[PDB]
Amino acid sequence: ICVNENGGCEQYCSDHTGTKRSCRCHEGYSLLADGVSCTPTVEYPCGKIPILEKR
Amino acid sequence: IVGGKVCPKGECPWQVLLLVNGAQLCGGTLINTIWVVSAAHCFDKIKNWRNLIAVLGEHDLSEHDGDEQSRRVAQVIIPSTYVPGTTNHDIALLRLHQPVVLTDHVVPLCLPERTFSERTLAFVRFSLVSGWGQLLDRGATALELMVLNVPRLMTQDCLQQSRSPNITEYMFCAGYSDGSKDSCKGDSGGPHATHYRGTWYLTGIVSWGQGCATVGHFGVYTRVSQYIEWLQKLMRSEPRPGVLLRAPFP
Ligand SMILES: C[C@@H]1CC(=O)Nc2ccc(S(=O)(=O)C3CC3)c(c2)CN(C)C(=O)[C@H](Nc2ccc3c(N)ncc(F)c3c2)c2ccc(OCC(F)F)c1c2
Ligand SMILES: [Ca+2]
């Protein structure tokens, strides 16, 4: 599932025993209830540009 | 950087400037508050290991605006498989003596997981390369940070499109063969950053080429996805005395 369109995950994807898939996030982010989206939990998450985010 | 543009101040917040005795040495990428990824070849000629400085929040070399943060480099970690003066395994992991403070101008780039980088990031066509390197082949280096968008090629495609060493599984080609746009020697160690669903990730390191922006040749970048496990294990390790450390690879 992870090989195809990143398994629908915004960030990381883990394949499980069967047709199961778990999305995960980098440190400084948490997974939303949709099970695919990553939201920042810190002021300066990695790979985001503050002057563009604050606009 | 040849044929790019000035990176607007604060839009490349993970870019590092490496200095030796106050002189420009190479670029680098901040991946958290204490670790920097650069190129192993940046350190081939270093004798003054205690005079290595990393600068974060840098933009214009002619002026100090208060956003710059300087740190001494406590450790330079290079894979055992890297041979000085050659191209393969061109990566270095740098430990800063004290962490940088994250601000609107100092932010780490995400180091991705190997699977995500190989299965997804490797297929994003364009990525950004940046540095204070040469603005022209045999020309002056830049006073303001420059950035360039470059497309990635499959290695079979790079070899057929090129007019010289091998491109190994630890490298990838990116750029143009018409001599208009490329990263240069002074950009060595800097990031090749990839955007995916609203977030930027580290995919390459400015490594080598056959003259800057020369017709028939592409830029060659270290394939960072091959080093994720090696980097993660070292970031979990305790510091060792002495600046230079050679660590087994794989
Ligand atoms: C690392 C590989 C082998 C080697 O010569 N090692 C090597 C060791 C130390 C130094 S140093 O000055 O102490 C250090 C930077 C501070 C250097 C080089 C300086 N230097 C010439 C360099 O750093 C240059 N780097 C780049 C980087 C990107 C380039 C690009 N994207 N397009 C065109 C270029 F010309 C691009 C050129 C480069 C050109 C060819 C090349 O190897 C050529 C191969 F045929 F052997 C290599 C590197
Ligand atoms: Ca400055």
Residue B178 sits in a domain whose CATH number is 2.40.10.10
DSSP string over B189-204 = T-EEEEEETTEEEEEE
Rounded Cα distance, B100 and A13, in Å: 30
Task: Report the half-sphere exposure of A36 (CA within 13 A, side-chain side).
Answer: 9
Bridging pattern class, strands B69-79 and B146-153? unpaired
Compare CB distances from B116 to A11, A43, A47 and report the shortest one's residue.
A11
Residue B245 lies in a domain: no
- Dig out the tokens for B240 from the structure: 């060792």
In total, how many domains does chain A have?
Answer: 1
Which residues in A lie closer than 8 A to residue B31 (C-beta atoms)?
46
Q: Take atom 4 of ligand 1 and give the residue whose Cα is closest.
A: B85
Q: What angle (nearest 5°) sits at the alpha carbon of residue B227, between those of residues B82 and B75?
A: 65
Pairwise CA distance, residues B14 & B57, whole Å: 8
Structure tokens at A48: 């985001």
Asked if A22 has any chain B CB less than 8 Å from its own CB, the reply is no
- Tokens, residue B227: 């080093």
Backbone angles phi, psi at B158, to 5 degrees: -65, -45
- For residue B156, what are the contacts with CB-CB under 8 A and spacing of at least 6? none
Count Cβ neighbours within 10 Å for each residue of A21-45 and write b for 16 or more, e otherwise. bebebbebbebeeeebbbeeeeebb
Q: Which domain holds residue B126?
A: 1-12+109-225
Asked whether B110 and B13 are in contact (CB, 8 A), the reply is no
Ligand 1 lined by B209 (C-beta under 6 Å): yes
Name residue B163's amino acid.
R
Bridge partners, B75 (sequence order): B95
- List b or e across B222-249, with b for residues whose CB sees 16 or more CB atoms inside 10 angstroms: bbbbbbbebbeebeeeeeeeebebeeeb
Domain match, B104 and B125 both: no
- Within 8 A of A11 by CB-CB distance, chain B residues are 116, 197, 199
Kindly state whether residues B31 and B93 are assigned to the same domain: yes
Q: How many domains does chain B have?
A: 2
- Does some domain include residue B198? yes
Range(s) of the domain holding residue A36: 1-55
Asked, for residue B4, whether it belongs to a domain, the answer is yes
* Distance (Å, whole) CA B176 – CA B159: 13
Question: What backbone torsions phi and psi does residue B166 show, to the nearest 5 degrees?
Answer: -75, 155
- Give ∠ CA A20-A21-A26 in degrees, rounded to 5: 155
Helix (H) or strand (E) holding A50: helix A50-53
Residues B205 and B118 in one domain: yes
Q: Note whether B220 and B114 are same-domain residues.
A: yes
Q: Tell me the residue type at B72.
A: R
- B6 and B30 housed in the same domain: no
In a domain, B244, yes or no: no
Q: Is residue B246 part of a domain?
A: no
Q: What is the C-alpha separation between B205 and B187, in angstroms, rounded?
A: 9
Which residue bears the tokens 């810190």? A42
- DSSP-derived pairing of the beta strands B199-208 and B171-174: unpaired
CB atoms within 10 A of CB A46: 25
Burial class (CB in 10 A: 0-12, 13-18, 19+), B23: exposed
SS3 B42: helix
Residue of B41, B166, B181, B218 to mutate, ligand 1, most atoms within 8 A of C-beta = B41
What is residue B133's DSSP assignment? Answer: -
- Give the whole-angstrom CA distance, residue B85 versus residue B45: 10
Cβ B216 vs Cβ B102: under 8 Å: no
C-alpha span between B108 and A53 (Å, rounded): 15
How were these coordinates obtained? Answer: X-ray
Total residues belonging to chain A: 55
Within-domain flag for B194 = yes
Beta-carbon count within 10 A of B210 CB = 14
Instruction: Report which of B190, B171, B196, B202 is spatially closest to residue B4, judged by C-alpha positions.
Output: B190
My answer on whether B221 and B231 are in the same domain is: no
Q: Are B174 and B153 in contact (CB under 8 A)?
A: yes
Q: Are residues B120 and B165 in the same domain?
A: yes
| Residue B114 within a domain | yes
What CATH number corresponds to the domain at position A42?
2.10.25.10
- Asked whether residue B155 falls in the same domain as residue B193, the answer is yes
- What does the buried/exposed string (b/e) look like for B87-101 if buried means 16 or more CB atoms within 10 Å of the residue's CB? bbbbbbbbbbeeebe
Check whether residue B4 and residue B121 sit in a common domain.
yes
| Residue B178 annotated as lining a ligand binding site | no
With a 6 A CB cut-off, is B38 part of the ligand 1 pocket? no
Q: Which ligand is nearest to the CA of B40?
A: 1
* Cα–Cα distance for residue pair A47/A33, rounded to 1 Å: 22
Declared resolution, Å: 1.9
Rounded to whole angstroms, how far apart are CA atoms B113 and B48?
A: 34
- Are B125 and B5 part of one and the same domain? yes
- Neighbouring-strand partners of residue B20: B23, B52
Determine which residue's CA is closest to atom 8 belonging to ligand 1.
B41
Residue B190: inside a domain: yes
Q: Which residue of B has its CA nearest to A9?
A: B197
Tell me the best of B208, B210, B212, B220 to mutate to test the pocket of ligand 1, counting ligand atoms within 8 Å of each CB and taking the most: B208
